[PDB]
Structure 1
Amino acid sequence: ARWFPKTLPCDVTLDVSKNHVIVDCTDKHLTEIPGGIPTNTTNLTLTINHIPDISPASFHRLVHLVEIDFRCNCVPIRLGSKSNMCPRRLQIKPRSFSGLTYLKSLYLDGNQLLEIPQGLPPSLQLLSLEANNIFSIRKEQLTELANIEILYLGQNCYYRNPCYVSYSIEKDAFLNLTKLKVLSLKDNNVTTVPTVLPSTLTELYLYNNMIAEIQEDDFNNLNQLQILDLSGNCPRCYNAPFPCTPCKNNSPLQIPVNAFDALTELKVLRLHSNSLQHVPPRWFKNINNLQELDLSQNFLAKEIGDAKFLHFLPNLIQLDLSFNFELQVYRASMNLSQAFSSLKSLKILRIRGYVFKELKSFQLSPLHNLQNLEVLDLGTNFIKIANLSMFKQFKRLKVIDLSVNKISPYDKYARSCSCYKYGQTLDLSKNSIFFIKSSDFQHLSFLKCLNLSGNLISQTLNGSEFQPLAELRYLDFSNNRLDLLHSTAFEELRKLEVLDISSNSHYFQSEGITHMLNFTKNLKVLQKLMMNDNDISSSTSRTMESESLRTLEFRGNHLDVLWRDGDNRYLQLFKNLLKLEELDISKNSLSFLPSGVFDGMPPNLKNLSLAKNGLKSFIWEKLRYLKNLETLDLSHNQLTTVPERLSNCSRSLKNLILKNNQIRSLTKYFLQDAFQLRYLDLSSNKIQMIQKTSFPENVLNNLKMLLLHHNRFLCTCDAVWFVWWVQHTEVTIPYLATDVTCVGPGAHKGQSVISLDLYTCEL
């Protein structure tokens, strides 16, 4: 099979057309760059680790490197897991990167470097220096980066990682980086925008700084700029869960009217959390092509009423206007201006946090003609009165989000080291609807999904509540109180395809009342039924029935009492679900499967899930009754023994998952003749030795994956074939270097199974 046992503890990828060889040691706790790295590599990854420093010998022989990823090898005080200390920062020797003529990108984020490393090659196009302790930028240290294109100098001075002085940037330190395109100076205690900036900028991220004023000659040359993030300078700090220093006298970021003049190619402009009170239309005079405009967390609740500046944004695609309420004001209505009708190309419109009382009909009348409008977000407004029949006018929409309301009948780019596919959606999750009348959902026939999760509705549905929802294809009814007393529940939902009644545990917990679990017979096109976490322990109906159900999730219920000893009533509880192909009876406290349930399983079953149950002994010779099973999932159980011969058990099994089980050693003919299998998982067990007789490469040659890590191989010389095969076969076994370790004997504890070579075995 192989004569090249490669002990390199990091993965390798080969895309010979891309001419790329990617060797990634991510989260591998190495104390040094290993030897034997191929000279063929292009991308190298050395993130969270314990590497002490760099040296010219680090990348000595590697000329074909285009990418080095050295992120966060000594995390700052508050920015990383403080179970892993470095004794001090990283140190980079002189001429530590010059020998990399083909280098193009380099990530040194989170490494407590105090100044920018020098000697980098001129071919470098990217450079990430975030979460470091560089709080001073001078021209002479940027002399070497005259060809750079991406420069991430963020998170160098802020509350998670402080430096106690404002960012200093000397005059025109960035000017002669003529190829510079992206510059992210976020979270750097910067006090002024660093003029003069290169004219070839396309993205400038100055957000979360202490910039209080903008000068008129500040964005004066950037005419190829497309993104401008000025978010969080002079923030809105009330009730902020993070340390934030507002401006003086509660002032908004002072931007002159003629500041966005030279910006003509501007496409994104984020002014989130600027304590803004007005937004002049003169800002948007020259920016013709603005697409996205963030204006959250300001004091614009009075501007949203006027909002003159929207007549200048005819190409606007997004408009975030969330969280602009005035403290201690609970408005009776939303006051959107008539200037919202000039947003011809608008698609998304989030106005959460406008806190107000009643959503009436004609308050959204400006939006009655935005033909491209799709999302209409109105969560977290504490609305109380809202006639849902007023959305017979927003039919062409795609989401009508009305979550956390009360209706009744910092750094989101911090790279630390559903219903919508079905059509129109009405999200009424987490409102205060305590019962369902059919007349409420009148005029909402077009609805293809309805989320009612979290309303805590206590109701015995008798098949009349959702009558006008004629086209409904998805219904989320989780986290409610459903009384399944009638089998005619959900009967008028004729086109329904998904039904979620999970976490409706209240009445299913009760003992003695009826639970008509055959309510699915009348649902002709239902494809998926989620009813997990319902504590279903009893059922008046002896069977479930549906000629179309294909998925059933039944996890977090009580099937041990339904399948109690001597109780043959609910043995064929699923047998009549004919098209069913994926059962998820997991976390059902099942301590043993009563012999006979497998004869009462649907015929076309394909993907079974028995995870986290408590299975003390799951018989296998009954698998033959499932002549279509492919994805048996028994992870996180308490089995002890494996089948005698997986050939004799199932003739179609291909996805066994015995993760986190209690197995101590497999059989002598385990995978004997069982060719059809294509995936297996014995991770996190107590298995000790695995011989050859049960693992013929006749079978192994086709296994796409196989996991045996975190278990208890005692790696003595009883396992010579184990050694030779595990470090000389090409069966994929992930983490073959770090987590599948050896328990013994003694001096060979903590050994790798790939680092195994017992020479004195046949001496």
Structure 2
Amino acid sequence: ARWFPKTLPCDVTLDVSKNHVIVDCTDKHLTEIPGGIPTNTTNLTLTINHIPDISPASFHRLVHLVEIDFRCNCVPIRLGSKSNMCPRRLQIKPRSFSGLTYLKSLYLDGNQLLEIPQGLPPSLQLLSLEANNIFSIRKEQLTELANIEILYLGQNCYYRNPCYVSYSIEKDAFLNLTKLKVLSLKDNNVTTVPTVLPSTLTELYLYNNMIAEIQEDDFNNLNQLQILDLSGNCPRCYNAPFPCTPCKNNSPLQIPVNAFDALTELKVLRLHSNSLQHVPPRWFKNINNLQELDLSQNFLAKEIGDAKFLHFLPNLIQLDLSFNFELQVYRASMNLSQAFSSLKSLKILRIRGYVFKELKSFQLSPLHNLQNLEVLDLGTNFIKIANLSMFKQFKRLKVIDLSVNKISPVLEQLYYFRYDKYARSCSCYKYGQTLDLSKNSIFFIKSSDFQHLSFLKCLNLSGNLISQTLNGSEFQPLAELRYLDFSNNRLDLLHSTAFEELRKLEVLDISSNSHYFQSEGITHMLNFTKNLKVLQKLMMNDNDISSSTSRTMESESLRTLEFRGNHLDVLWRDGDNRYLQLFKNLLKLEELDISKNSLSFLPSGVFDGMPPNLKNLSLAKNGLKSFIWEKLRYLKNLETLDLSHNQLTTVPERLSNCSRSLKNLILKNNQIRSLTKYFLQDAFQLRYLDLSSNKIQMIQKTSFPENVLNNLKMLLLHHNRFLCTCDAVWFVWWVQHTEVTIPYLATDVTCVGPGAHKGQSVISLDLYTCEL
């Protein structure tokens, strides 16, 4: 046990490897810099707090600092919290940083700062001033920043943080910063490319601005430049989910043909949402090392059919030409240029939102000999007609995405339509070849549909209109298939011979296929699992299963079954003993999720009819009012038990008398008010205990023995109704001097009383009066 309790409301970590003393005070509702931070502290984080000022006294002793993270302490109105708004901007007093000799990184994002903090140490390499109110950069301001390498000045003038004027940058403002490597000026209302920039630059971000034209001499000296982003300058504002204003007369970002002549070392060129109509081949005359080219959200639908520029990119790896569609035009077919065959290196190709009625083998002919091609993304294209057998010339490919289409007989939810994807805050693919057909209109399936696709390892048929009775003669060609996602469909389990043709299948997802289970008298064959000789994981979540024609599910291979969101309460209706041995015959089963099954009580015989090798069992979100803990004696292999979000008021008299196997117990979000006299007594196998978010008042030494407690990896106690009287004298002392990992010890492990101590942390408590 500890000699001195850790009273500091910050997570202190030690990294002797790099001699870093990391102090983390992220979102600890601070109003002052916490007193008593180690002198040997190097990395200090104070994000999402309410510290109103930074005076020299702030970092006084800690002269060993190398990083200061003072982000979002006064986050702008439109970007930050409306319940707890910032009253006055962060006040940085002079000589606050100049003393910190060893400082290398300084983050001051979202603090409503009016100017570049002067008096900074010459050791600084990184300076972040994002989301502040600095929209006038002058040469005098950056004189102190001589040694800076990475500079973030972005988000200082945009729709979420306006300045109502254009961004101003002095002539040759960044020119004397002879060590500058990274420069971000994103989301700033910048009208023209700041010049002259230092030749030492390698990354340049000028996206989401007022730049309407590029000069030929704009990047004449940036020979060392590797990444350049000129996106959101003359944007394609159609269906934009953010205030978007395009260049007058819908004009594109005017770039001279010889503008990228100096950028020999350029690898990434992002030209997303620039209203571009033509891509001149002359652009890439001297860039033979380009690997990533983002040409999404432009008007290059006609240019895709020509694309003479592709001949100058034989080293290109990534090509994004998404949402280049001409509105009012619903194309019959996709015109792909024969030039796409000259992309000898290309691994990733993305052509979403081209918009066309029909997909044919002939259309994809220029890609037929692209040896390195791994990904083909043709999603959100409204393709009505497509013959899947055409992808036999694409066996080498890892992912063939056709998600969100209208075919009938991993990137984020918002990727191409978000203002800034790289904005800062405060999956079956592994199995092999994947064909994504999710969110389509396939209403009926047959063996002939998957002809020649024997090679597939994963197939996604989620969100289709398959309202069929499968007899195991629908996916006959897919012999190699290991994963099938059949979620969000209308599966009809009339036959127990369903899915049996997929003889190599390891993962089956039949979740959210509730339609037929939601109607009375319909035959449901859940014993279909028996024929799947290699099935490892099965998901039948949110299916509303209240009836079953088969009394048992059979399997000699299955290890994981997700049965969350069904009606086991109806299958297990007290008096009805027919479905109590339902999961008993899934012999190799180790994991069983029977959460969200409306089980207010578990009928006697559920524990006896459990598979022999069950390890992890969840009964979470069931509204369980009563539980017979003693019955866990049947679950002889049990290690984990999730009983979170229930109505349980009492723990067992002796946990060791219930299970000798049980390691991790979860009892969070219940109604427990008091633990039993000798609860955890003699339960030496226990390694994890969550008792957080309950109504517990007192915890005694008998209920929580030290020999049992000191072997726990983590003990969760936060959000309880703790009474800090003289009877809680053991608990207060134990919690303070323990080595056991108690999370939120200085934010949610607090007293509800008596009076004097109401709303005070138990860690800060001093019950010396109980000792006089």
TM-score by length of 2: 0.98
8 Å contact 2:7–2:764 — kept in the other structure?
yes
The 1-side partners of 2:580 and 2:237 are apart by 60
The 2-side partners of 1:20 and 1:716 are apart by 40
The 1-side partners of 2:534 and 2:283 are apart by 54
The 2-side partners of 1:720 and 1:642 are apart by 22
TM-fit CA distance, 1:665: 1.4
The 2-side partners of 1:644 and 1:77 are apart by 53
TM-fit CA distance, 1:633: 0.6
SS at match of 1:12: strand
The 1-side partners of 2:406 and 2:598 are apart by 37
> What's the C-alpha RMSD, in Å, of the aligned pairs?
0.8
The 2-side partners of 1:586 and 1:221 are apart by 62
Structure 2 equivalent of residue 398 of structure 1: 398
Report Cα offsets for 1:303-336 as digits up to 9, x if no partner: 1111111111111110000000011101111011
Structure 1 equivalent of residue 525 of structure 2: 516
The 2-side partners of 1:439 and 1:19 are apart by 64
TM-fit CA distance, 1:438: 1.2
The 2-side partners of 1:330 and 1:643 are apart by 67
The 1-side partners of 2:451 and 2:93 are apart by 72
8 Å contact 2:77–2:85 — kept in the other structure?
no
Report Cα offsets for 1:577-614 as digits up to 9, x if no partner: 00000000000000111111111000111100111011
The 1-side partners of 2:515 and 2:248 are apart by 53
Report Cα offsets for 1:718-754 as digits up to 9, x if no partner: 1111111110111110110111111000121001010
SS at match of 2:245: coil
SS at match of 1:392: helix
SS at match of 1:68: strand
The 2-side partners of 1:327 and 1:705 are apart by 57
TM-fit CA distance, 1:239: 2.4
In structure 1, stretches of 5+ residues that fail to align are none
Report Cα offsets for 1:690-729 as digits up to 9, x if no partner: 0111222211222111111011111112111111111011
Give the one of 724, 735, 738 matched to 1:726. 735
TM-fit CA distance, 1:621: 0.5
TM-fit CA distance, 1:365: 0.4
Report Cα offsets for 1:192-216 as digits up to 9, x if no partner: 1110111111100000001011111
TM-fit CA distance, 1:526: 0.1
TM-fit CA distance, 1:74: 1.1
Q: How many equivalent residue pairs?
A: 763
Structure 1 equivalent of residue 116 of structure 2: 116
Structure 1 equivalent of residue 749 of structure 2: 740
Report Cα offsets for 1:387-436 as digits up to 9, x if no partner: 01101111110111011110001100111211101111111111110011
SS at match of 2:281: coil
SS at match of 2:447: coil
TM-fit CA distance, 1:45: 0.7
SS at match of 1:552: strand
TM-fit CA distance, 1:559: 0.3
The 1-side partners of 2:83 and 2:24 are apart by 23
Report Cα offsets for 1:364-389 as digits up to 9, x if no partner: 00100111101100110000110011
The 2-side partners of 1:134 and 1:189 are apart by 12
TM-fit CA distance, 1:624: 1.1
8 Å contact 2:618–2:642 — kept in the other structure?
yes
The 2-side partners of 1:647 and 1:99 are apart by 58
8 Å contact 2:316–2:345 — kept in the other structure?
yes
TM-fit CA distance, 1:153: 0.4
SS at match of 1:520: helix
SS at match of 1:475: strand
Moved more, 380-389 or 687-696: 687-696
SS at match of 1:357: strand
8 Å contact 2:44–2:67 — kept in the other structure?
yes
TM-fit CA distance, 1:77: 1.9
SS at match of 1:21: strand
SS at match of 1:120: coil
TM-fit CA distance, 1:471: 1.2
TM-score by length of 1: 0.99
SS at match of 1:493: coil
TM-fit CA distance, 1:49: 1.3
Moved more, 74-83 or 298-307: 74-83
Structure 1 equivalent of residue 574 of structure 2: 565
8 Å contact 2:77–2:86 — kept in the other structure?
no
The 2-side partners of 1:465 and 1:321 are apart by 35
Report Cα offsets for 1:133-181 as digits up to 9, x if no partner: 0000011110000001110000000111100111100011101111111
Structure 2 equivalent of residue 477 of structure 1: 486
8 Å contact 2:443–2:465 — kept in the other structure?
yes
Structure 1 equivalent of residue 4 of structure 2: 4
Report Cα offsets for 1:531-550 as digits up to 9, x if no partner: 00000001110100010000
The 2-side partners of 1:292 and 1:668 are apart by 65
TM-fit CA distance, 1:108: 0.5
TM-fit CA distance, 1:615: 0.6
SS at match of 2:73: coil
Report Cα offsets for 1:556-581 as digits up to 9, x if no partner: 00000111111110000000000000
8 Å contact 2:382–2:405 — kept in the other structure?
yes
TM-fit CA distance, 1:100: 0.6
Structure 1 equivalent of residue 325 of structure 2: 325
SS at match of 2:269: strand
The 2-side partners of 1:47 and 1:668 are apart by 42
Moved more, 39-48 or 578-587: 39-48
The 1-side partners of 2:769 and 2:761 are apart by 18
8 Å contact 2:124–2:147 — kept in the other structure?
yes
The 2-side partners of 1:296 and 1:717 are apart by 67
TM-fit CA distance, 1:9: 0.2
TM-fit CA distance, 1:244: 1.4
TM-fit CA distance, 1:456: 2.2
- Aligned 1:575-590 pairs, distance under 5 A: 575-590=584-599
The 2-side partners of 1:124 and 1:530 are apart by 52
In structure 2, stretches of 5+ residues that fail to align are 410-418
TM-fit CA distance, 1:6: 2.0
Structure 1 equivalent of residue 357 of structure 2: 357
The 2-side partners of 1:666 and 1:66 are apart by 47
Report Cα offsets for 1:642-682 as digits up to 9, x if no partner: 01111111111111111111111112211111111111101
TM-fit CA distance, 1:510: 1.5
Which runs of at least 4 in structure 1 moved beyond 4 Å after TM superposition? none
Structure 2 equivalent of residue 496 of structure 1: 505
SS at match of 1:13: strand
Structure 2 equivalent of residue 618 of structure 1: 627
8 Å contact 2:177–2:198 — kept in the other structure?
yes
Structure 1 equivalent of residue 248 of structure 2: 248
- Asked if 1:59 corresponds to 2:59, the answer is yes
8 Å contact 2:395–2:455 — kept in the other structure?
yes
The 1-side partners of 2:171 and 2:592 are apart by 66
SS at match of 2:664: coil
Structure 2 equivalent of residue 147 of structure 1: 147
The 1-side partners of 2:118 and 2:448 are apart by 72
SS at match of 1:615: coil
SS at match of 1:196: coil
TM-fit CA distance, 1:338: 0.7
Report Cα offsets for 1:67-113 as digits up to 9, x if no partner: 11111111112111211111111110001101110101011001100
Moved more, 753-762 or 322-331: 753-762
TM-fit CA distance, 1:617: 0.7
SS at match of 2:305: helix
The 2-side partners of 1:5 and 1:417 are apart by 29
SS at match of 1:51: coil
Report Cα offsets for 1:215-267 as digits up to 9, x if no partner: 11110111111000000101111221211111112111011011101101101
8 Å contact 2:288–2:313 — kept in the other structure?
yes
The 1-side partners of 2:617 and 2:386 are apart by 44
SS at match of 2:366: helix
The 1-side partners of 2:436 and 2:484 are apart by 10
- Aligned 1:278-293 pairs, distance under 5 A: 278-293=278-293
Moved more, 355-364 or 668-677: 668-677
SS at match of 2:515: helix
The 2-side partners of 1:496 and 1:81 are apart by 48
- Asked if 1:173 corresponds to 2:183, the answer is no
The 2-side partners of 1:98 and 1:246 are apart by 44
Identical counterparts, % of pairs: 100
8 Å contact 2:158–2:188 — kept in the other structure?
yes
